[PDB]
Amino acid sequence: EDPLYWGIAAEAMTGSHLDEVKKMVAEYRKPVVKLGGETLTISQVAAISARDGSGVTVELSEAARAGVKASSDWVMDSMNKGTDSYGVTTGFGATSHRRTKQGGALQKELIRFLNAGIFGNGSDNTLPHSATRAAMLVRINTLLQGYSGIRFEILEAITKFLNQNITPCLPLRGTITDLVPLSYIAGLLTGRPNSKAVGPTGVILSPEEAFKLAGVEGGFFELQPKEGLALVNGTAVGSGMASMVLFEANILAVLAEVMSAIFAEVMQGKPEFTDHLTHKLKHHPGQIEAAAIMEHILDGSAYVKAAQKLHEMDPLQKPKQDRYALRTSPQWLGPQIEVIRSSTKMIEREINSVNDNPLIDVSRNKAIHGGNFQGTPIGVSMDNTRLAIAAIGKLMFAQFSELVNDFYNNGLPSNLSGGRNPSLDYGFKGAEIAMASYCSELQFLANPVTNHVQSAEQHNQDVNSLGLISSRKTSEAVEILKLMSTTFLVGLCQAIDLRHLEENLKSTVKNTVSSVAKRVLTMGVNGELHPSRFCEKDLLRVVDREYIFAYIDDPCSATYPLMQKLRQTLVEHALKNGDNERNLSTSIFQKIATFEDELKALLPKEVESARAALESGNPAIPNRIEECRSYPLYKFVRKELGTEYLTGEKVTSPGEEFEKVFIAMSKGEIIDPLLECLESWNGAPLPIC
Amino acid sequence: EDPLYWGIAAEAMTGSHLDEVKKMVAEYRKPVVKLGGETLTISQVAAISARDGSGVTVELSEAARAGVKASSDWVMDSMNKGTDSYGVTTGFGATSHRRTKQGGALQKELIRFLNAGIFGNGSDNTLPHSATRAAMLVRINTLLQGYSGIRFEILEAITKFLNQNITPCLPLRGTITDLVPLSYIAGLLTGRPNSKAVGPTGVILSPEEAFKLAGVEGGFFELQPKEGLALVNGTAVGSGMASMVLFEANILAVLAEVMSAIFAEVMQGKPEFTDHLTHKLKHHPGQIEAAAIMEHILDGSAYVKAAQKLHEMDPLQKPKQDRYALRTSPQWLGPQIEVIRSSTKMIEREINSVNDNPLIDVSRNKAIHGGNFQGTPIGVSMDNTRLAIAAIGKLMFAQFSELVNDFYNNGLPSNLSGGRNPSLDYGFKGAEIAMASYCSELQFLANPVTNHVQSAEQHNQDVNSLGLISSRKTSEAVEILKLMSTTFLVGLCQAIDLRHLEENLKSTVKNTVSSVAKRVLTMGVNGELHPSRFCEKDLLRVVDREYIFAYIDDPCSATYPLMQKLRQTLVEHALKNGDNERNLSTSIFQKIATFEDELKALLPKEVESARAALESGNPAIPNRIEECRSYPLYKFVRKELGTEYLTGEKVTSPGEEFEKVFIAMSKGEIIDPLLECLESWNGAPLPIC
């Protein structure tokens, strides 16, 4: 038995978060949103909220018509009092004019006085068109259950406004959660003189023009008793925006998980941080999933092809462990995903609720007075979600910070500088400062809204949810997270390209050091300069150990580590060379100057040629990202969007390439390549038995 | 003309902040606080709030008696109505029992219903005894001006409670600013059955016992009309605590300025960050003062005895500039000092105000109704001050963080590790984590209180100041700042000692390298090994350049920089030695192994002997702090308090030495050595013409 509905709520949180997101995306893309009052999802709200020409249409279920008609008829019959039925349903004052021999005067008055919002000039004080559409959809859905006492024909009209993209202008502020803004939908429906709508290209329309462009099958509505209240009493503005916000938040949470893995790839982090034992032993499902997702990426990574201590390619980090933004990312992200998921279910309940008062219960033949207009689930879910968005942002800032710091990024250039001359390429330094600015503002936004409740409306509304205000702040937080995600993703793709450059230039240095050592370290009296064999292999070990980016811009400079360490190796072999060292013809020390002169003459041009080869699409060694599970995201950013590698040798600024990713992100184009990174995952961690 | 008193307020902010603090300290130490209603300072409140046996006493000015009597007489005469004077003064309901043929029933009722606070068991819900004493003092002072209609004898009684350290128990919470808590002072005065006081050693007293121990010249008071309101209507609880808080805040602001300079000394920062031109050109007085204070310290610093690039002692930072917590400290601290100063003046006005209602104006023969109980100046000053305390804390965290990071601290050991074996001495690492915890909590506390106003008391108090609640949060913030200041100051003294160790061990290494090079790099066939002269001087240059703490724990280790760089120098000289290199007897290369063997045999014991000499109080080179203007603070912490140098060679933990400084700080013992650091300063910056 599940008498209080905790059971059904619990069941909605089984299965992975990723499978939930996949389902959300598939639902978003459906061509038709069919409303019946009970199956509206945040994905449908997000799809409809769009004004981007996807062609999505809304259809009302005919199965809901009978119940809607029953309560609208009931209210009309209820007005006939005394010698018929009883007193009067209930507006907010039994005495006045309501369609008897009167004429619906109270409903006209309701919408007039609720039109108390301020738009001013321009758009700064107007609710976004997307958000108004979300509100309209939710508003229809929460009147379809048949308990609201409104005509189906009004629902059909709002549906036409949605389908023809004719959008009433609503004020941004005025609600403590949504009478004031919702009264501007009602005022369009009733052709109030101040009502305005906007067409698909932004043209301002009169209510007359709006009805004609939308195809409304009728003239202005004259509201019946209960209809004005039915239209204005909902939580639809707050919950519609919350739905939009949570669609984005769910996707960005998956992006954060996958970026944490790509971060680990380019950082050469020890992949054992994702070992399932660790996460199993904490029990938290968000953390277990996050780790299993990162593990999936790392298990199919060509970078995790790692050479251990005294490294040649990628090392673990045994001495000087990986820092927390890498190694604790599953622990950090997990609870944020859990909050986003729980919040999503709260909002999905809200947008299928009857948020009206009083409810018209035809079965019991009475109106039921209550408090379902109290949007607490919106306020609470949006405050909690905003805190989680801030936490996701903080981790991204910390990861980004590690990535661009040459002391923490395991050999990558300071600032992810791309060009031949580091003194003319400061890479991501400006972006890094911008990332701090994004993170700081996100942490300010993390503060709650719902702890600022005023005792309102002659102290009748002595608690009130502040749901829309909170939704608006969470929306602002999500936009900043998209700025951060954009900046970080472009940074990660830069680092991928730098690792490709690194492996190629290291190969060329080894090749050249080899050639020179062979020529110079045998000469003798008669060839074989004893010794030379162990000396060559140790010189190459220097190359394998040293960070390319610590010297490759001036490889034969006396004060850079290549020349220094190569000389140190020659000196070490000379000191071990015994009596052969004391004969000039077999002396290693006496070949240092020659070795250095011959390396200086050859190495710069060899490095330059290899680099040019790589820049022309013909590197000696292919870019290992092509064999990684994360390739779809790199391919998308680099090839599909044309985001280019950033270098001080060219004029292009980081912002110019960030625009490409941000604009794509805001159009939903990152969804497919993101999910493609995980499409082979079976939804389970790797075994640990 | 100054009709609105902006002029007098402006004049109170002339002269330096430091001179203000000096004056504050001198006032604090006076043996007698004489109250007249108009000259109470935060220093007097702080002195009285103490329960530490300083012997400070309160005395009431006889000059105030006449005005106090006039208004108390006026109220009593005003009760005689109709055939005498007029209706009735004004309590809060003209109808009832007030000392005619009645008996002061309304005043008894007032105190009863206001006793609505909760103490529970233990001390967690009780106002601190210090803060209650502050409240008592302010409460007396704000009734002495003669407009309150209360008997002088009641003021004399509260004075006795202060002088004999008999303190009524007040609830911690219950006020939106201070009826509820102040009613517990009134309830002691009237011997309410639930009233309690605490004696000097914490013994709980009945009102009877309290009167007897305090010497009250009378039995319990029977309050006259207006007396109950006069006692309970003030802002004294909030403003008394604010006064305490601001006394500490002013001192800690000076400590932060001086510590910023000592930080710069031990970091080897470029002192030009304090150049007066820079700060003059921004005009902000707090910043100009802060810079001039730091400049004063640095101008008398034996550390600012600096050797420039290719350094031997202390360098500037031309390449890789000093980081912001060093170089922007005046810009950062200035506005915080300005806010602390402005807040101080707000509170000093408040504690000399008449915060009562109605005011009894004997000259005009009427009661004047108004709103002076509205403690907005407390709420606002305490919110603004708390934000400034958080900013001071953030800078201290950032400075501390630089100080303990070997990548940022210009040669000091990672963690300020003190012992011979770094693998068994992690220094201040735990303290550094604690510093983050302090800073984070301070940033939470920085949020305002005064934006959480409820519409209170049947919506009569539809705005209210929340002054005490804010004072309490600012007090908590100040305590955390004292934890941070303690931890940082002990860290700075450790760094001072490490710089002393560094200079001494470097001297010993130079001496030894010199001796060995002289012995080994001349041998030849007949003495003079050509060459040897330039080789020796370059080997010493290696020692001068290299950071002692990068190798001194194992100075002849092959993989540490001393052995490596010394070998590099020998090799460089051999390569330049021409044909002499090719003769075995004049070869520099052939002496490397010998040089290294002889250095390995001598250097460890020489370093150990020098160190032991230093530890015994007989270093080769004296600790340069003895010749610095900052010496008084180091001397205080190290000698006077016995705070010892921290080392993993001993059992003592950092916390144990932090206790010494924290306890001293909380007793005001840091004030004198702090101010001594600046006592030669003439209050002006160094000239820049």
| CATH code, domain with A592 | 1.10.274.20
The secondary element (H helix, E strand) that includes residue B46 is helix B42-49
Q: What are phi and psi of B368, to 5 degrees?
A: -115, 115
Which tokens sit at A535? 């000396």
* Rounded-to-integer distance, Cα B305 and Cα B624, Å: 10
B-chain residues near A584 (CB < 8 A): 582
CB of A685 within 8 A of CB of A298?
Answer: no
Residues A687 and A632 in one domain: yes
Let me know the angle formed at the C-alpha of A149 by A146 and A152, rounded to the nearest 5 degrees: 70
Q: What are phi and psi of A32, to 5 degrees?
A: -130, 130
Residues A222 and A299 in one domain: no
CB of A536 within 8 A of CB of A517?
Answer: yes
Query: What is the bridge-based pairing of β-strands B366-368 and B167-168?
Result: unpaired
Residue with tokens 């001036």: A554
DSSP alpha helices (H): ranges in A207-284?
Answer: 207-214, 227-232, 236-267, 276-280
Of B376, B432, B386, the C-alpha closest to B409 is B432
Residue B413: which region, alpha, beta or left (left: phi > 0; alpha: psi -120 to 50)? beta
Contact state of A451 with B452 under an 8 Å Cβ cutoff: yes
CA B686 to chain centre: 26
* Rounded-to-integer distance, Cα A22 and Cα A43, Å: 11
Q: Measured between CB atoms, which of A407, A447, A455 is closest to B455?
A: A455
Residues A27 and A47 in one domain: yes
**Exposed/middle/buried for B7, CB within 10 Å: 0-12, 13-18, 19+?**
exposed
* Rounded-to-integer distance, Cα B214 and Cα A227, Å: 73
CB of B333 within 8 A of CB of B259?
Answer: no
Residues B205 and B110 in one domain: yes
End-to-end CA distance of chain B, in Å?
A: 37
Of A634, A687, A648, A646, the C-alpha closest to A258 is A634
CB of A24 within 8 A of CB of A250?
Answer: yes
Residues B398 and B524 in one domain: no
* Rounded-to-integer distance, Cα A634 and Cα A643, Å: 10
The secondary element (H helix, E strand) that includes residue A360 is strand A359-361
Of B54, B276, B259, B67, the C-alpha closest to B151 is B67
* Rounded-to-integer distance, Cα B391 and Cα B328, Å: 13
Q: How many domains does chain B have?
A: 3
* Rounded-to-integer distance, Cα A343 and Cα A376, Å: 12
Dihedral (Cα; A393, A399, A403, A409), 10-degree rounding: 170
**Exposed/middle/buried for A45, CB within 10 Å: 0-12, 13-18, 19+?**
buried
Query: What is the bridge-based pairing of β-strands A57-60 and A32-35?
Result: parallel
Of A621, A688, A665, the C-alpha closest to A259 is A665
- Best mutation target, A406, A466, A571, A583, to test chain B (most B CBs within 10 A): A571
Strand partners, B568: none
CB atoms within 10 A of CB B212: 12
Q: How many CA atoms lie within 13 A of A483 on its CB side?
A: 21
* Rounded-to-integer distance, Cα B627 and Cα A108, Å: 86
Q: Which of the 8 DSSP states describes residue A205? A: E
Is B86 part of the annotated catalytic residue set?
yes
CB of A532 within 8 A of CB of A522?
Answer: yes
* Rounded-to-integer distance, Cα A481 and Cα A373, Å: 31
SS3 readout for A404-449: CCCCCCCCCCHHHCCCCCHHHCCCCHHHHHHHHHHHHHHHHHCCCC
CB of B465 within 8 A of CB of B376?
Answer: yes
Task: List, in order, residues 6 or more apart from B108 with CB less than 8 Å away.
Answer: B190, B223
* Rounded-to-integer distance, Cα B635 and Cα B493, Å: 9
Question: In angstroms, what is the C-alpha Rg of chain B?
Answer: 33
Secondary structure percentages of chain B, helix, strand, coil, to 5 = 55, 5, 40
Residues B561 and B670 in one domain: no
Residues B361 and B415 in one domain: yes
DSSP three-state, residue B367:
strand
Residues A272 and A368 in one domain: yes
B-chain residues near A575 (CB < 8 A): 592-593
Domain final residue, candidates B216, B235, B254: B235
B-chain residues near A387 (CB < 8 A): none
Let me know the angle formed at the C-alpha of A164 by A161 and A169, rounded to the nearest 5 degrees: 45
Query: What is the bridge-based pairing of β-strands B32-35 and B366-368?
Result: unpaired
Task: List, in order, residues 6 or more apart from A224 with CB less than 8 Å away.
Answer: A72, A75, A76, A99, A104, A107, A151
Q: How many CA atoms lie within 13 A of A119 on its CB side?
A: 18
Domain final residue, candidates B585, B603, B623: B623
* Rounded-to-integer distance, Cα B229 and Cα B186, Å: 10
Select which of B86, B547, B560, B631 is catalytic.
Answer: B86
B-chain residues near A414 (CB < 8 A): none
Residues A23 and A165 in one domain: yes
CB atoms within 10 A of CB B1: 4
Which tokens sit at B152? 């002088």
Instruction: Please report, for residues A122, A354, B359, the alpha-carbon distance to residue A370 in angstroms, rounded to integers and kept in the order given.
Output: 39, 11, 49
Helices (H) and strands (E) in chain B, counts: 24, 7
Of A641, A626, A614, the C-alpha closest to A490 is A641
CATH code for the domain in which residue B494 is found: 1.20.200.10
Strand partners, A34: A59
CB of A354 within 8 A of CB of A443?
Answer: no
Task: List, in order, residues 6 or more apart from A599 with CB less than 8 Å away.
Answer: A512, A513, A516, A556, A563, A566
Residues B220 and B286 in one domain: no
* Rounded-to-integer distance, Cα B452 and Cα A3, Å: 39
Which tokens sit at B139? 């409460």
* Rounded-to-integer distance, Cα A518 and Cα A339, Å: 63
CB of A165 within 8 A of CB of A200?
Answer: yes
For the annotated catalytic residues of A, the residue numbers are 86
B-chain residues near A459 (CB < 8 A): 455, 459
* Rounded-to-integer distance, Cα B227 and Cα A146, Å: 65
- Best mutation target, B406, B575, B590, to test chain A (most A CBs within 10 A): B575
* Rounded-to-integer distance, Cα B673 and Cα B224, Å: 51
Which tokens sit at A547? 């960070």
Task: List, in order, residues 6 or more apart from A515 with CB less than 8 Å away.
Answer: A602
Residue with tokens 């008193």: B5
- What is the residue type of A255? L
CB of B617 within 8 A of CB of B592?
Answer: no
Of A250, A473, A242, the C-alpha closest to A376 is A242
Task: List, in order, residues 6 or more apart from A579 with CB less than 8 Å away.
Answer: none
Of B254, B258, B251, the C-alpha closest to B301 is B258
Q: What are phi and psi of B491, to 5 degrees?
A: -60, -45
CB of A80 within 8 A of CB of A99?
Answer: no
* Rounded-to-integer distance, Cα B174 and Cα B251, Å: 30
Q: Measured between CB atoms, which of A452, A575, A593 is closest to B575?
A: A593
Of B14, B12, B16, the C-alpha closest to B685 is B16
Q: Which long-range contacts (CB under 8 A, 24 or more apart) does B515-520 make?
A: B515/B602, B516/B595, B516/B598, B516/B599, B516/B602, B516/B603, B517/B595, B519/B598, B520/B591, B520/B594, B520/B595, B520/B598
Is A29 marked as binding a ligand? no
Strand partners, B523: B527
* Rounded-to-integer distance, Cα B311 and Cα B305, Å: 12
The secondary element (H helix, E strand) that includes residue B176 is none
Instruction: Please report, for residues A160, A594, B535, the alpha-carbon distance to residue A601 in angstroms, rounded to integers and kept in the order given.
Output: 77, 11, 29
Q: What is the resolution of this structure in A?
A: 1.7
- Best mutation target, B387, B459, B589, B597, to test chain A (most A CBs within 10 A): B589
Q: What are phi and psi of B55, to 5 degrees?
A: 85, 10
Dihedral (Cα; B172, B174, B179, B181), 10-degree rounding: -20
CB of B658 within 8 A of CB of B646?
Answer: no
CB of A292 within 8 A of CB of A276?
Answer: yes
Query: What is the bridge-based pairing of β-strands B197-198 and B167-168?
Result: antiparallel
Task: List, in order, residues 6 or more apart from A216 with CB less than 8 Å away.
Answer: A157, A160, A161
CA A131 to chain centre: 19
Residue-wise burial string across B242-278, b where 16 or more C-beta atoms lie within 10 A, e elsewhere? bbbbbbbbbbbbbbbbbbbbbbbbbbbbbbebbebeb
Domain final residue, candidates B235, B250, B267: B235
Instruction: Please report, for residues A73, B154, B181, B499, the alpha-carbon distance to residue B136 in angstroms, rounded to integers and kept in the order given.
Output: 71, 12, 11, 50
Query: What is the bridge-based pairing of β-strands B32-35 and A366-368?
Result: unpaired
The range of the structural domain enclosing residue A403 comes to: 236-501+624-689
Q: Measured between CB atoms, which of A459, A568, A575 is closest to B592?
A: A575
* Rounded-to-integer distance, Cα A601 and Cα A519, Å: 13
CA A570 to chain centre: 53
Q: Determined by which method?
A: X-ray
Residues A355 and A434 in one domain: yes
CB atoms within 10 A of CB B456: 13
* Rounded-to-integer distance, Cα B281 and Cα B158, Å: 52
Q: Which of the 8 DSSP states describes residue B456? A: B
Task: List, in order, residues 6 or more apart from B283 with CB less than 8 Å away.
Answer: none
- What is the residue type of A359? L
Is A233 marked as binding a ligand? yes
CB of B593 within 8 A of CB of B521?
Answer: no
Let me know the angle formed at the C-alpha of B571 by B566 and B573, rounded to the nearest 5 degrees: 100
Instruction: Please report, for residues A209, B270, B293, B296, B681, the alpha-carbon distance to residue B686 in angstroms, rounded to integers and kept in the order given.
Output: 75, 16, 10, 8, 10
DSSP three-state, residue A32:
strand
CB of B111 within 8 A of CB of B192?
Answer: yes
Residues B283 and B400 in one domain: yes
Contact state of A589 with B567 under an 8 Å Cβ cutoff: no
DSSP alpha helices (H): ranges in A521-591?
Answer: 533-545, 561-575
CB of B640 within 8 A of CB of B646?
Answer: no
DSSP three-state, residue B33:
strand
- Residue of chain A nearest B568, judged by CA positions: A568
Task: List, in order, residues 6 or more apart from A10 with CB less than 8 Å away.
Answer: none
